[PDB]
Structures are given as C-alpha cells and as structure tokens.
C-alpha cells in the first residue's frame with residue numbers, strides 16, 4: 001500500500017468548491033448536501049477534495065480551539081462522502097493570516113492539524129490530509145519547507161501512515177516544483193495546481209484585479225498542447241527523481257471562457273496528467289467553473305467527460 005497506490009485511488013476526482021472554504025458554509029453559493037457525493041460517485045469520479053477554512057472556525061486566542069459544531073459538520077460531510085465509496089481529501093484552505101505572517105501563524109496551523117488529526121485518526125485510509133492549500137507570499141518556499149514538516153510531525157503522532165498531501169509553494173504553480181524540499185516520510189503525495197494560461201482560464205473572473213478580458217480562445221493547436229506537455233514533464237521529471245507521486249489538485253477554466261475552448265483545454269490537461277501518472281481533481285463541482293447543475297440535475301457534456309475521461 002505505497003504512496004503511488006494511494007495516489008491511483010485519488011484517480012479522477014473533483015473539488016467541492018465554494019463551500020467549506022468560504023467564511024461560512026453556503027456564503028459563497030454552495031452548501032454541501034449529502035446527495036452531492038452519491039451524485040459524484042454515480043458519474044464516475046473516484047475522489048472528492050474538500051477545501052476547508054479551519055482558520056475561520058477557531059478561537060482567536062491560544063490554543064485556537066476549533067468550534068465543536070463546525071468540527072462535527074466536517075465529520076458528517078466526510079462520513080457521507082466515504083459512505084459513497086469515494087476517496088476523501090480534507091485540507092486547510094484560505095488561511096489569510098498565514099500568508100501575511102507565517103512566523104506567527106505557523107504554530108496556529110500546527111494546532112489546527114493537531115486537533116483535526118486527533119478527531120479523524122481512526123478514519124479509514126481513504127481519508128487523506130492536505131496540510132495547506134497553495135503556500136504563497138510571506139509563506140515562501142523556504143518557510144513552507146520549514147513549516148510543513150512541523151505540521152506533518154504533529155499529524156504523525158496520531159496518524160502514523162495516513163496519506164498526507166504536500167502543496168507546491170508559490171500558489172502551487174508547476175514551475176516552482178523544484179523549490180519544494182521533501183521529507184523522509186513515505187506516505188506523502190506532492191500536489192500542484194494548473195491554471196495555465198491564466199488569461200484563458202480566469203478570463204472575466206471578477207475576483208482577479210484587474211478583471212482579465214474575455215474572448216480568449218484555447219484552440220488545441222500543436223504549440224498549445226506542447227506548452228501543457230512541457231509544464232507537466234517538468235513536474236514529472238522532478239517527481240520521478242524524488243520518487244514521489246503527483247496530484248494535480250486543481251485545474252479548470254472559468255465559465256466566462258467559451259465552452260469549445262474549455263472542452264479542449266480541459267481534455268488536454270486531463271490526458272497529459274494521465275500520461276505522466278498524475279492523479280487529478282477538477283475545479284470544481286457546481287459553481288462558476290462547475291460541471292454539475294444542481295437545479296437541472298445534469299452534468300454539462302462534453303465538458304464533464306473532458307474533466308473525467310469517462
């Protein structure tokens with residue numbers, strides 16, 4: 001039961017976006033209904049990645065205790081996901097203070113994972129932990145390389161062998177993969193995110209400032225495919241050198257991009273990842289990058305097939 005076998009269990013997955021990583025669940029548009037996981041399994045996904053903003057559910061002061069009600073909610077969500085025979089990834093996501101002052105908030109992340117690891121320690125091996133989403137800014141490659149092992153150390157005290165996913169630093173952009181220093185732990189998976197070209201995938205996304213213009217195409221030209229292949233080969237050669245499996249944790253193009261381009265970009269990214277033995281998770285389930293319409297109760301096609309491969 002090696003890290004590579006567990007990586008294959010992640011397989012082709014999907015992110016439950018705009019839910020538990022909002023300040024409050026539902027305030028970004030998605031409340032996780034129990035049936036969503038049955039719906040996700042039924043379509044053919046192997047896994048679900050669940051972004052969680054734990055940092056908005058803890059006391060301001062030490063020992064940064066996680067709200068009991070929030071913790072039981074997450075427990076319930078995990079329970080239902082696992083009962084639907086999915087692999088489940090829970091993370092810490094959008095810890096804004098960590099990006100600004102990691103020397104101060106690094107110990108807070110440790111305490112958060114102390115508590116989450118303790119609550120989930122007896123869960124089946126199909127639940128994975130992911131220490132942090134997209135280290136960046138003040139949480140530099142170097143500080144991340146210092147911080148993550150300490151959180152991992154803490155996790156290992158109660159969960160000796162559970163799969164733990166380590167994000168690439170600098171927003172987990174592919175090109176920073178070589179900056180990540182690896183530990184001796186043999187039950188880890190390295191994760192990067194892919195949104196290239198950013199002016200395609202995030203065109204018209206109001207949350208980017210300035211808002212990128214729309215009308216950007218992705219056409220599947222040989223040169224366009226090759227861009228993607230070269231980026232992933234770079235991740236691939238590093239990973240093989242270091243004997244670590246790779247998880248493409250997020251990839252997607254915003255719905256304000258033209259559908260034809262989205263289908264081509266999405267299917268190309270998925271195929272290239274499969275080619276390098278990367279597991280993957282589409283961003284995201286049902287909102288602005290979404291594959292599933294909650295109201296019409298239908299998966300958008302062929303985009304969903306482009307994301308999933310079936």
Ligand SMILES: OC[C@H]1O[C@H](O)[C@H](O)[C@@H](O)[C@@H]1O
Nearest residue numbers: 018027028029206207287288
């Ligand atoms: O990543 C942050 C933002 O992403 C997207 O814009 C979501 O629609 C929004 O809910 C969130 O504020």
Ligand SMILES: OC[C@H]1O[C@H](O)[C@H](O)[C@@H](O)[C@@H]1O
Nearest residue numbers: 134170171172173193194195
């Ligand atoms: O979630 C934060 C996002 O925007 C950032 O600029 C990163 O470069 C990108 O990898 C990520 O998707």
Ligand SMILES: OC[C@H]1O[C@H](O)[C@H](O)[C@@H](O)[C@@H]1O
Nearest residue numbers: 017195202205250283288289
């Ligand atoms: O969908 C809203 C945004 O924030 C999320 O955390 C995603 O990771 C990123 O890809 C996107 O830009």
